[PDB]
Design a protein around this ligand. Sequence first.
Ligand code: HEB
Ligand SMILES: *[C@@H]1O[C@H](CO)[C@@H](O[C@@H]2O[C@H](CO)[C@@H](O)[C@H](O)[C@H]2NC(C)=O)[C@H](O)[C@H]1NC(C)=O
Ligand code: NAG
Ligand code: CA
Ligand code: CL
Ligand code: CL
Lengths: 104, 465
Amino acid sequence: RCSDKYRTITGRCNNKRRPLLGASNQALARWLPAEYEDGLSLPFGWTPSRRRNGFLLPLVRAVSNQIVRFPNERLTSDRGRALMFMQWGQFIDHDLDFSPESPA
Amino acid sequence: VDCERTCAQLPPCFPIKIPPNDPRIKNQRDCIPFFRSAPSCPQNKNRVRNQINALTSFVDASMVYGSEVSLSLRLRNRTNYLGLLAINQRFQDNGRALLPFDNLHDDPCLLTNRSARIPCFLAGDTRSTETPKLAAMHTLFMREHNRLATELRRLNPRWNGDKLYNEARKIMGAMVQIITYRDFLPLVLGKARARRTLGHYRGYCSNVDPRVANVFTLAFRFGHTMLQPFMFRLDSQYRASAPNSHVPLSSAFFASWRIVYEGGIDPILRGLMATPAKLNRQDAMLVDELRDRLFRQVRRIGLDLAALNMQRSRDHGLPGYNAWRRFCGLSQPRNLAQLSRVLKNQDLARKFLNLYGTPDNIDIWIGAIAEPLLPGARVGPLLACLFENQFRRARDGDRFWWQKRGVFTKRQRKALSRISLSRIICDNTGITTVSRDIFRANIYPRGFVNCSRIPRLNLSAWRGT
Ligand code: HEB
Ligand SMILES: *[C@@H]1O[C@H](CO)[C@@H](O[C@@H]2O[C@H](CO)[C@@H](O)[C@H](O)[C@H]2NC(C)=O)[C@H](O)[C@H]1NC(C)=O
Ligand SMILES: *[C@@H]1O[C@H](CO)[C@@H](O)[C@H](O)[C@H]1NC(C)=O
Ligand SMILES: [Ca+2]
Ligand SMILES: [Cl-]
Ligand SMILES: [Cl-]
């Protein structure tokens, strides 16, 4: 019987008919089907010559260098939000999700 | 193999390679290390790979309490029946509690200041000391739990330790939900937009799937664009008077020693209230403290958070930018002219197409944070759609949502509606002047008031319940 007074620690029993829904240690939900280079598990970018939609993929570090990188003169503070706004966002992200890494 | 010690593409690694024109990494055979996310249920091999969410998808303060039972008990003070969370036994912050220390193999906090020998803090989530700003939030909320259990004991002297902990935990989960939905989400999405897309709470729906989606774990990294290059620390008069008031983030990651030996959490909380966030701009997306020097004091090379985010969506098998636009009922730009209108920026669209060839291939985090911001929001339309989808699910699919009839009494909901993050700071720190509208940029003394002006949480509605 799921409790009607307190949450479990793991989130199990929040949904009574599907008790693991929203519980910890389960697969992340998918809103669209997964897309892998081999249709199963190899990421796009795994094989340099394997195209995605007919085009070769750029190195993620080249995208970072060419689009994300900027010089100090362009740094702009947000007149409408405090760093506390950013910090609540990181803190609530840590209430919602964490994907563990594969160990060495 | 250890992905930190080889650039080979051997399991479980997916190394980030270096381009020939790199402005920082001039060893062409180096790499930014990268471990693939662990697969869910690894027994089945012919199935499509999925990644795990180690935390509860509900907004339930699981970052304070833990999402595993054994950890949740490890975080409790087991020496008495006061229903408290365990505190540091070696250090205190001006007489106030600090988090306990974790016991990690290869603790990264020890590497940030070898002579200080201060390990990472222990909290409900494994990332609590990723910055001292985040550790300060964790410390503040651990104190609020103990304050609640202490006040609940005064009102209910016969409640046992488990009831004190359970009731304080239930109040804390509600406070995190209120701060998130009432204060934070309207400022991420725009106030009218949040009302229109999230709507008013209509009750619990047992057919809603509340799980966090794989794409949300990438899209909600939009926050990386709001970091300034420094951790800001301010004195009791909100002045950057100390000689190390602006610490570059690359000397603050995992630096628990800065909380222990450089003034506790009040200077950090004051810095967060009184310093504006960085604005996400298309020509100024991510500071180099994160794009080039991420975790440099604890890893063999400074990482690049933007490169990690883009490699991570590939790792997680996520569809590209146009598939997510389509999911959101947004247009799918196919060429330069269309991408230029979607991004309201021809030069940025040209750079994307030079790198990717087609907008179908743009990795979700970079395409989503590149969209122009909607009025009153800090997201473009794609991130607004994805976040509205996740936060609507977390609320409507949660059987313990704070407004659901029977979770709290009517008097308790009325008392909870007065809470604020500013009040939590007033109640658990030595700070007596705080910003009222805490998430807005407030240039001290504008928008700052004495704590006596901030509403309190009246716990009378918990007497005899
Ligand atoms: C160091 C660091 C900071 C602060 C200096 C930070 C900040 C945020 C904010 C403000 C977020 C949202 C409003 C946010 C969300 C998420 N992050 Fe980020 N973040 C920092 C560092 C990291 C690192 C490192 C990662 C992992 C990168 C990789 O893929 O290897 C990272 C991830 C995330 C996630 C994903 C959590 C998960 O489900 O695994 C979110 C939601 N951050 N961060
Ligand atoms: C368990 O709770 C007790 C009561 O709050 C904590 O006791 C305090 O301990 C510190 C030293 O760690 C003393 O300076 C205080 O005076 C103590 N307070 C009281 C009222 O006795 C105790 O530290 C907690 N234990 C753990 C492991 O968290
Ligand atoms: C390391 O911490 C000690 C305090 O234990 C401090 O005196 C010293 O200056 C710190 N080192 C650096 C490089 O800040
Ligand atoms: Ca949670
Ligand atoms: Cl997904
Ligand atoms: Cl920087």
